[PDB]
Design a protein around this ligand. Structure first.
Ligand SMILES: Cc1cc2nc3c(=O)[nH]c(=O)nc-3n(C[C@H](O)[C@H](O)[C@H](O)COP(=O)(O)O)c2cc1C
Ligand SMILES: Cc1cc2nc3c(=O)[nH]c(=O)nc-3n(C[C@H](O)[C@H](O)[C@H](O)COP(=O)(O)O)c2cc1C
Lengths: 447, 450
């Protein structure tokens, strides 16, 4: 049996994904800016043996023509947030084995300082760091915030390739793994193992030494989730663990086959890339109890939010249209035969499903046995290597999965019983060594 | 007058042109382990020190245009860790200790720097400080980032623009009570959340800030520029100014000039705090302290001094007989350097450099002698505290805490412990955690004036 890995999707802000369940009485996400919130989440995850916590990030915000509507602040749709690298570092200090994965942007980070920061996390954590490589999902606002011009979608990925090449040189080529000797009767470092790098790319330039010596993993575990044609090529080249949003099993299976074919086209083994699907659930001892439990979180969300956030995430201002109007009865846009995928849905239908989960994956709602069976049928049907648990409320959604579903998966032998490897790469990739595989591009920048 | 005490640290093994890492009691070769930092922070927090300060650098040694092998054999310059990451890890290990980190206005981007510092301030409940630098490793650091070099005085003009932008983000973007998080009312009050607009010579920003108003608003601002332009910048923005060691009459003049600069910027002379770097070597008798210091100096490889002197000054003295008067090298010296070296030989210069690099010269003696030196400095130069710069770690810090700090507390010149939750309250001696109204950053508050 393939043993699935599990990570927890989190972000350093109250609400996410176009939903706003922060008003639910048991939701603690409004305390995201306190260290106690994060210490508790991490302890829950580490005591359960979850492989990692993943901190999503964004730099921009939801806006309509340069302005956030009141609702953004009355319901905390987007802002405020914290920086994930700072949260990750704080969590290092209260964990020993839990993996820590953070989003970091190739569009807005400077590679030289970013490489030093990530390698610092990797040193202090003893090799537990991952990096979710993003360009931007909020390109308009994030660019204005940093004072830089727009970069079009595919050019963002060419910039990301150049970024990756430089950070690979800094992580893998600047200091050999054994450069540091720290012998008070010998050498501090072997001068033959410390190298100047030289990089002249279309977007970035660097000439000189790297600040950080070779870290326990070398390069953080690389996560990536792009679904465009160009983003799929980028993930096929660099990504070690690829995230997928929820989809019906047959569609997910085809996407998995496509992503593994992109890795093969870049010279990598098909099984050397790990696929993890977002997965949400609401668990209760009976099916009806779960439905009511899910219902109570849905009822906690203000009804005006659904229309507001659907607008931003898609562009369709639906406040006007009566809920009985078929979607296909509207224009706005979409490329004909795509409009047929709507298959005669009504505005009410879309907003009700959007109210339910936004861009988060549709939760599996049922008993522990029902949720466990869903996980297994997803993993087997789509050839997945793990799941990214996306909570509907914190910490309850995580606690429920840990206390009721994970033990079933463990008894069935589909989930490991605990931490068997000390670095994140060894744990997620099954590698023997904590460092990149030889068929990964970053390995080609080693001395 | 209650003196404040901070610990000067950096996230690398050696610093300041010296290299005492081979001393049997030095543990700084473990700088890249969390356990080293956990231990330092506990030692400091248990003693009630006001803060730990993390220096930083981005560049490396450049001796005759190359990086010679001795830089790696002795770990003179590299490797290092990022101080924001060390600081964040130390947040989670401490509850009251202040954490001050260096951050460069030349190389950081202000929008993400503002968010990073405000995140540290939120998570720490207001215990963060920022030592504002314009990089000192400018040449090599610029090449690493791929950017053109910027002149000394231009760096301070860029720094003024950087400060204006981060003040808008920290003080002007979210009012202090914008967040209500009332599950029956509003998450945030939309009238208290503001777009910023900034169009400066070096930086541009248009939009909202990522982080809401943090417990101190703006981190406590530390600064250490000693040039004329750097003193002007400190007098405008710095809340705590760090001075290197010097004889009492010289420190007193520097303190006087910095306070006059603050007054000219519209601030109260006493609202800026002056802290001197202070090093010491402590033993139970004077003679034992002298010998202890000799054993520190003997731990440094003899070949280091001439190589690190060349790194810091550009002057390679390795080919000269040590009896050579510096005056004979005038073709390689500016007029100011010739005057400063007058009477000195190459051997004098390298002997002095071997003993302490650019670190302050230690007071060497008994605990009573060191305590007396601290009081004399503070009274004679009008200082508000001291930045303890260790010669070896953790020994230098432990010696001071165990033997000198109790004397200072008995004499009533150092506080018993922590009776202020934020770093600004503790260091400025105020009940208010946010910038004073006569500070430039306060003018960006939307609260009555935007
Ligand atoms: C599970 C998951 C997590 C994601 N997290 C982030 C994130 O933290 N920041 C971000 O900008 N985008 C995030 N995304 C969006 C993707 O990075 C990506 O941009 C999107 O799938 C569209 O693909 P494309 O970039 O190739 O157009 C996430 C996507 C998924 C499926
Ligand atoms: C106690 C002390 C600590 C310093 N720490 C740093 C540091 O961490 N990083 C840095 O680039 N410069 C550091 N400096 C150098 C000063 O910031 C400054 O550049 C130097 O004093 C020269 O002054 P000027 O910039 O006005 O010419 C420090 C100086 C002192 C006295």
């Amino acid at each position: 049996m393939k043993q699935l890995r599990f990570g927890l999707f989190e972000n350093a802000q109250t609400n996410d994904s176009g939903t706003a369940t922060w008003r639910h009485p048991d939701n603690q996400r409004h305390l995201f800016d306190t260290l106690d919130y994060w210490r508790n989440i991490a302890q829950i995850c580490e005591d359960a043996g979850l492989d990692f916590v993943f901190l999503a990030d964004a730099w921009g915000w939801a806006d309509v023509n340069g302005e956030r509507p009141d609702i953004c602040d009355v319901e905390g749709l987007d802002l405020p947030r914290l920086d994930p690298a700072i949260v990750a570092a704080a969590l290092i200090a209260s964990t020993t084995k839990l993996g820590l994965v953070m989003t970091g942007s190739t569009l807005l980070e400077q590679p030289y300082s970013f490489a030093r920061r990530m390698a610092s996390l990797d040193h202090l954590s003893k090799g537990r760091i991952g990096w979710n490589v993003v360009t931007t999902g909020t390109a308009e606002t994030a660019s204005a915030a940093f004072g830089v011009p727009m970069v079009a979608h595919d050019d963002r990925y060419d910039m990301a390739d150049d970024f990756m090449e430089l950070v690979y040189k800094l992580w893998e080529g600047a200091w050999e793994p054994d450069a540091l000797e720290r012998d008070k009767q010998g050498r501090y470092a072997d001068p033959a193992k410390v190298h100047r790098i030289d990089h002249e790319g279309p977007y970035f330039r660097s000439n000189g030494y790297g600040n950080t010596s070779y870290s326990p993993q070398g390069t953080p575990v690389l996560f990536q989730a792009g679904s465009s044609e160009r983003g799929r090529q980028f993930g096929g080249r660099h990504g070690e663990c690829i995230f997928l949003g929820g989809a019906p099993i047959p569609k997910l299976a085809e996407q998995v086959r496509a992503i593994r074919a992109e890795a093969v086209a870049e010279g990598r083994a098909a099984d050397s890339i790990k696929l993890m699907a977002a997965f949400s659930c609401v668990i209760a001892p009976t099916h009806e109890e779960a439905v009511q439990k899910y219902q109570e979180v849905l009822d906690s969300q203000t009804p005006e939010v659904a229309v507001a956030s659907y607008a931003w995430f898609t562009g369709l201002d639906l406040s006007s249209y009566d809920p009985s109007t078929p979607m296909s009865e509207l224009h706005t846009e979409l490329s004909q035969t795509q409009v047929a995928r709507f298959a005669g849905l009504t505005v009410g239908d879309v907003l009700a499903d959007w109210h339910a989960h936004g861009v988060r994956t549709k939760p599996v709602v049922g008993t522990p046995e029902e949720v466990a069976d869903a996980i297994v049928e997803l993993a087997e049907g789509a050839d997945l290597d793990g799941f990214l648990l996306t909570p509907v409320i914190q910490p309850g959604s995580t606690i429920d999965f840990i206390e009721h579903v994970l033990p079933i998966l463990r008894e069935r032998g589909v989930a490991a019983s605990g931490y068997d490897a000390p670095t994140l790469r060894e744990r997620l990739l099954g590698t023997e060594t904590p460092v990149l595989r030889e068929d990964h591009p970053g390995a080609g920048y080693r001395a």
